[PDB]
Amino acid sequence: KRKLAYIWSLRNAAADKAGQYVPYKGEQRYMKSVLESLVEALNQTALGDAYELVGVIYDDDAELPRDQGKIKDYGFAYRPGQQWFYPADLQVQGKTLNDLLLSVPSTYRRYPRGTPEHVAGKSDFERRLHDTLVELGADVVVLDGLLVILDELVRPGAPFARRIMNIHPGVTREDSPYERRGAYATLDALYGARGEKVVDWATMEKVAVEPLYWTGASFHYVDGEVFHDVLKTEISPDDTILELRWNNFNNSLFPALHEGLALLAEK
């Protein structure tokens, strides 16, 4: 079992409506999280034979009022009979899933961006990331929506540099026709379907473009080079953003992460 560690910013999961039902196609669909899908994968398939999920790290901090607002619907820990990112009772490999939550808070965000304290903290948070994976002996790490950008953890000769991966909601190949890199990838995919691309995001300035009707998800290295790729999400012009996210999560993302891990295991 290639020891697996998972990282995500809880605030990012709330935005995406993770663990919530969303109206889709005129009715509703449950917006399953990336972790829930992985938990199901580890439980019901041979992928489970290859890995043990060891820790589920999240970086949010309760002392950041913006971090608080962002998960108001969820809350930092599970409330009784209330909304949660997955069912509070979920089990992964005979381990209560909730029991694996870890916070390695990026508190450094309290200080202003670029300030010496902000930077000194960011390094220590990355330093704290490294340290506790090791506390978990993690053989492998997945990032799903972790908002901090790791520049130091993916250093030359650091113990997890090639063992650290991000699942991204779009293709990431340089010369790929459907490449949808960045934090705007889901929205770039929805607007590309309209044959329109956004020139300036603040004021929604746009431009005509050849329609693209497909998107996918990338399981790539973080230092990152693509290790496994899927592109199975047809995109429709009348599609909403909630529909596109779910479909890419269901058509291409869950598969890429699992196939990527499966392949990644004999390495």
Ligand SMILES: Nc1nc(=O)c2cc(CNc3ccc(C(=O)N[C@H](CCC(=O)O)C(=O)O)cc3)ccc2[nH]1
């Ligand atoms: N169903 C439902 N629909 C939604 O749309 C929905 C939307 C949200 C987004 N919440 C946010 C709260 C605060 C910020 C922020 O950045 N604040 C900073 C710091 C000062 C402060 O902490 O206030 C600022 O003011 O500059 C951003 C987002 C949360 C639940 C939601 N639930």
